[PDB]
Symmetry: D3
Subunit: 122 residues, 6 copies
């Protein structure tokens, strides 16, 4: 049976001047931008590395255009350390998303700056 | 004992071209922009009017700079129809925020475009 | 646009003889009774100051007559440190309510003695 | 091995004059008062029969004196139709409790009038 | 009014070779097997004694044949330390169940080996 | 940067003789057994196709040996329609797991029969 591709990205969050900074690293330890191109059906797994001491946990992934069909689903682990995107790469196009996190310092949700997914179907 | 001001804003969400559009109205029924100036301690109450048929519910209010002290706390009702901001208007400045909503069509979170709160202390 | 009033009350909880005692203070640090009169639309914000060492968190606000229309809605923060009442002060009358809290010592919910809200519309 | 007693009570909730009325029935279909005497270790199982059309669900059982040791624990089913009290009947005395329920009409919690448990150890 | 029987079982969980082992004890401190015979309507209360240092909490009780009517309901305490089974012992027969637990080491659920309930109605 | 493999399995659940039957299908529509061999780091995505009319939702994936390191993490979607396993395929060996589901007919959790994951590292 046909398999897709599984991509793995670490979401490192530090504090600079009291506020969160999101640094993505790839499987080689290379800093990468937030943008991903998807060229076949698959998954994108984001692992949280919270270095802020603010108790960050993923609560989901947010979209300004959530019905565009670029990302099919979001799954989250019980400890808020992992989020995964399912992308069946049927609908071509681009979508902008932001990570949504809770914190233990206050009751405000934390948003990352926007990142982009580009689908190029097969 | 000293009282603050309570502001009330309706968050009307429609669909245009399949995607959500956020229209804020004030207590007079006037369309207003998302930006609010806070000139003393108080609360801002947002009531969801979901006209999308996508089962939107508030899940919180998100901030790219959540530790800036502009908004002190966020409260949410059990049905996801109300969110309230507490703003003690001690720390002057401006912060950008986006509403975060769940939907019943898919498992992606919905984000509004950004809005601004400006604190001018007394 | 028309604004309402935002009232702020601290809910101090101590232990006397092993059991919780609720002491309300107002914005001046004055001990006040639990009763509030509402004379226009607005909000009431309750901040938990738990001095019990029993891990108290708000889980809601309870009413024996919940459909009386005196309080329109209750919102709660994610950390259980704040609850807010929305009172549009359209329907005149009085309602009795009790704070509902979880604790970390056991699986029983904690109730405050009853307090009253009196609505006097404009 | 030693067994305790399991008591079963139906919590019938109707609306009279728009507001909830709690009617307890016992295993014979007899209306009973809310008060129970516990004369050995055991459980009390409360089954919700909501006749209000307000979508009531148990969310817990509340106590003004939650650390008195009369009731050891509360368990709740996932559908909010059952709550159970564990009473090891070690500590003698009496405690007053109220059922705490959510509803689908508004975001206020619903409280029953108080009921009493009397422990008489063996 | 007619009463049933309340049974009490402690679910002791240790680690052997890095993995959980479930040891049931009865009200006398005797190790018992997981199997219970129910000969009249009643409850079975399971208390978690987690000796693993893996932060185990009950999240429910699972069944391969959940619609067989042997167990009528499951209730759980807010701290995940207690689960209770309601067994009205109307439908005779046997059912196999496993405890379902969360842990704080990872995001996998923990299952006990299967145990059996045998109903013998009156 | 290095990518893994993403596998996709549909979890079809029917009722036979009143009880759930789990039928797995692969990306070709072929019925497959529950067992999967993992030969490099990647993800396994399970999509629920509930044909039971019992309101099944995934609540997690359970393991009798949850600390064996075969599966690194489980993620779940907000609607309970998807669960995903992360398998970094570092630790070789085999583990047995069961799907854990809630239902809307009763408060018992639903377990699948066991399935196996076999890790063969690279």
């Amino acid at each position: 049976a046909p398999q897709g591709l599984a991509q793995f990205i670490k979401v490192n969050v530090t504090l600079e001047n009291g506020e969160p900074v999101f640094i993505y690293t790839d499987a080689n330890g290379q800093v990468c931008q937030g943008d991903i191109t998807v060229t076949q059906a698959g998954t994108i797994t984001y692992l949280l590395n919270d270095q802020t001491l603010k108790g960050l946990k993923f609560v989901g992934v947010g979209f300004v255009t959530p019905f565009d069909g670029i990302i099919d689903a979001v799954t989250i682990s019980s400890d808020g350390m992992l989020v995964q995107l399912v992308d069946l790469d049927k609908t071509p196009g681009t979508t902008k998303f932001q990570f949504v996190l809770s914190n233990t310092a206050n009751t405000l949700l934390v948003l990352s700056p926007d990142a982009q997914i580009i689908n190029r179907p097969q």
